[PDB]
Design a protein around this ligand. Sequence first.
Ligand SMILES: CCCCCCCCCCC1=C(C)C(=O)C(OC)=C(OC)C1=O
Ligand code: SF4
Ligand code: SF4
Ligand code: SF4
Ligand code: SF4
Ligand code: SF4
Ligand code: FES
Lengths: 180, 197, 227, 584
Amino acid sequence: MTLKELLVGFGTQVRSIWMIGLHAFAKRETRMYPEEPVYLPPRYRGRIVLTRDPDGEERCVACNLCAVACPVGCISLQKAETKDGRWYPEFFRINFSRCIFCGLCEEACPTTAIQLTPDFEMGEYKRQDLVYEKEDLLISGPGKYPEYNFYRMAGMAIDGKDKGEAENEAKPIDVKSLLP
Amino acid sequence: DYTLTEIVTDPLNVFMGKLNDMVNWGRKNSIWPYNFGLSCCYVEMVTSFTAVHDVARFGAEVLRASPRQADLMVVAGTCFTKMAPVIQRLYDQMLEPKWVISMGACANSGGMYDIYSVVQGVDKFIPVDVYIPGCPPRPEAYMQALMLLQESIGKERRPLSWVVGDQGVYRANMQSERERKRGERIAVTNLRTPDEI
Amino acid sequence: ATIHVDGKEYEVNGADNLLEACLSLGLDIPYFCWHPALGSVGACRQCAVKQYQNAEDTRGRLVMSCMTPASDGTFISIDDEEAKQFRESVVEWLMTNHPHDCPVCEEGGNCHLQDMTVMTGHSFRRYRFTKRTHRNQDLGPFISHEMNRCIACYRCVRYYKDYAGGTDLGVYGAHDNVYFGRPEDGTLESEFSGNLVEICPTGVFTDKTHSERYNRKWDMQFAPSIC
Amino acid sequence: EPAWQTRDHLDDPVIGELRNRFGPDAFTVQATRTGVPVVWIKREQLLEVGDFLKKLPKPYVMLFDLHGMDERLRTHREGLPAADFSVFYHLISIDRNRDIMLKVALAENDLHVPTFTKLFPNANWYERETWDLFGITFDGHPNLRRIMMPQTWKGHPLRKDYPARATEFSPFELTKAKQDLEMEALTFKPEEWGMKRDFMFLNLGPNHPSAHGAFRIVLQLDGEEIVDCVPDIGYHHRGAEKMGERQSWHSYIPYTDRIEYLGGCVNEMPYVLAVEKLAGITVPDRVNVIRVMLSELFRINSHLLYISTFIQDVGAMTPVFFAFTDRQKIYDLVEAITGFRMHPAWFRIGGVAHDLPRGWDRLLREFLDWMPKRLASYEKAALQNTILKGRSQGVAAYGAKEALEWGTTGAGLRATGIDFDVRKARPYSGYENFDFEIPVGGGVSDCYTRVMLKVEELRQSLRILEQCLNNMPEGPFKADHPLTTPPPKERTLQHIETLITHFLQVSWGPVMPANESFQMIEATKGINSYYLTSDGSTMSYRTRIRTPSYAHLQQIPAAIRGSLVSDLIVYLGSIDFVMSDVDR
Ligand SMILES: CCCCCCCCCCC1=C(C)C(=O)C(OC)=C(OC)C1=O
Ligand code: SF4
Ligand code: SF4
Ligand code: SF4
Ligand code: SF4
Ligand code: SF4
Ligand code: FES
């Protein structure tokens, strides 16, 4: 081979050594997990929770929209009703061994009950323990949507909210009333 | 509360206990994963291997192309029907002690691919030590799984020699992380609104 | 008989009306107040098509297809822009007083009103005023009553009275306070009161026995069986 | 007339040429929303029609796609020839900047077509896959064997009567397949593999210690020289098209994410554009700008991965660490916007899932300041190294003729000097409003030439990001169409019409009216296309995904023959493929 290209190659190797050495003189780019906590943006799609309304009741009306919108089919729930007439989940289970954390259930929730939260540490020793029941999903507050209350908009009468007491609702006029 | 390979109690002289603790310390502080790329979960694994995450700090960066030298098999990807005998053969080629981490929903259960050409989870044919949910799990989830595996390794009993003592492997029955973190997870009230950064 | 729908020739039966003739051909006309067993009364005004006097006609006229006979040589258009806008307006007028109830309503996923709201392409609300409400009655152990969801399509009264021969269900009130139910709380006396849950296109009459252990229609496993 | 309007394309000169050559009754023109002339050709005239298109004055030189379709359950086939099955051939004329689909009808019993391998050599794998997934025989094919499923597979998975879900796992089948893998090297016959004839035989895979997947290559060797090589693919077959027949239009977006997993929103883009063609949705300009932003960010991510993987395959180990730090910066921005890292599933039918979060421009500005010095450092540290140039230059070269005849698109085709980028030739998603150049090669596609073209593409994507940051429109992030899935969330949460539309769209699915649409985009690795058939239902009747890695892997034996095995490793590292893209 040519001597000129040999000298060019030697100079290029020396230059590469020089850049790697100067990059050794640089600053570390490592975020030291777990001593340094990982920053997650507020809409990060991690662990799924069920949230509560500002009045403290659970937001889920067991409408099963998240379960059907799930492409993996890893949400199972059953509707139950209290004595006042509000709907709630009798049970709610998410199989997190199947869940792909796609956020379609949060997108499909009309009450903002189901939410994907910035939490990624969900490793488990047993796969059966990745099936999260309702006691593992229901949190103490409203999560990412602080003020929305579906039952303040719905037309059904529940405790503390009779007919005509929802948003943009008039009082019910009886057909027996004297006014035309 | 252990598992012998049957639910038995803790078998652990006091010098043998110290030797077992030293062996477990050396095993958990030096874990050599096998370089096996199935799907996108492997991309997040090797992302954890790089400079911005530095999985080398836990002593787990020596990524082996030979299953003989590897201690940890990270099934990180879909367990396809054509790839499942390859996975089983590579697991069989490993040496005791060997540990398995399912990374991602595909390796956990099949994930979104409940389809004709996918085996629904790698626990169908190999025993798994640590499962990671996610599609993909982020690199620090793989690091957290490594610490979970280290904590599981540090409380297991294995024979010091193949000629002296009980040769059974006693794996501890750990408390589930769901039950452990249920105290701090339910107490969460308010999160940051998604419209911010 | 011969009809021309959107410029396409069709051979139908002349004794039928236009809505049932077009539904028998696979054409999609939204409708509420018509039923194949109850006949046509032309209340809901949802089935509007544009009829022309002949082939060389451009103006036309909106007619109710449920009340228009499918006579020979009848020229109509379903996909006419004026007819589409009127059907969307009818769905919108029905939607002005409708409760925000679909997640907590037993007719969700099985709702004719949902299907026709989507079918008309109406998804933007420009009504900002209040919506009327109604008290509910107790109809017995079988039928649950939710009067807010009513669209005043009169199917229940026509079925229960003119078809089933029942006496205790009726329509009361006036202009936009029309009420459909019994004069007082009590069990529906007819032995065929349960068909109201399929006759009603909304969630007013619902299966209470199903509403105990409720699940949506897509979640059911069905089989063809004999009672 | 919008871009999604149903056209018959009878004004295309190819229709007039076909009428003047074969007569007016020799074929049937189908009106679609695919944007191409769709022509049903009789089976006995298929070879002469293909030859006539190959011998045009501005000929159709590339077979873009070739696949089957099971039409037995299709109810809305008005104006279509009677067909239990059909085979479509998508051909591209680069000089005309046009493309044509030819469809051959097939009866249920007579499932055989003449082979297309004589006219187009890249038809081999497409016909193998069509036989594998549909049972359609191709007469005259050299080795018509299964390519996705194993050879001991019963049935054809893409047929309508084939059960989509996973069968019950059995240890017996796993043990039998392990024994088959063990005795495969003992009872290897180089006749069923399409090979012929001191000739060593070696297996590279199936497991591979690299980031592009794990696949097996059977190598025939004369010493170090490669005499013949066939790839064993299908090891990463996820059944994505069959899942297209099983999900709704909205819930299939996460599956489109995982076609090639370095692309993300780049993979979401052709699917949502094709669904918007089916829905008649013209998205607003801010939607186009946001989707272009995310596509270019993920293009930079994928190109950084590709350059790092190539450099590590050559032998330098540090730039992969640095470019993974750069990928972390990109992932920070993408996590802020979409909420996820590599499978965002953020594109919606009619727009995107959310608006841009307040503060995204700071992260974009930080990345735009971070990137160019790092890219220059990568160039001066590894890409200008003479050892890397010696390992890369002159390795697996081909001209424009080989790139055209094998369907090679992306950086290889442009490294052969052919200036054919989808973002310029057939613009989509408002790419005409951005000023960016298309780098081209001198006429020879080396490994080094492909890598430097990808570097220049990275720089052009940085330029696109700069123009998008300086000029960001204000407006809606979703279209105002009734078929925008899902509707905007606040209107869903306080309006009953929007709640009804949301309820029916997320549960039963949006109803796409019966039509056929097609979208082709310039992905990170080549041309990625979605061909969508709707039978009027809430699910896709057919979801055909054309990926470029399939074509590049089929081009592999025609370019590496006569070379060494280290050259094969370098060629694998410089192709920019992932095995999920190959098998899908
Ligand atoms: C028998 C030959 C042994 C060669 C040395 C093997 C052990 C060192 C591996 C170094 C390494 C390589 C190459 C490497 O590519 C890599 O990235 C995935 C690492 O993790 C950060 C590594 O640690
Ligand atoms: S994030 Fe996606 S996969 Fe997970 S439960 Fe929700 S819809 Fe299902
Ligand atoms: S979509 Fe929301 S309200 Fe409906 S069942 Fe799911 S979590 Fe509950
Ligand atoms: S779990 Fe998701 S990210 Fe991981 S291999 Fe499967 S599709 Fe890829
Ligand atoms: S009757 Fe229909 S439109 Fe009305 S709340 Fe129930 S599901 Fe919704
Ligand atoms: S209660 Fe039902 S059937 Fe009766 S008028 Fe109202 S919507 Fe029609
Ligand atoms: S269906 Fe004709 S007006 Fe009601």
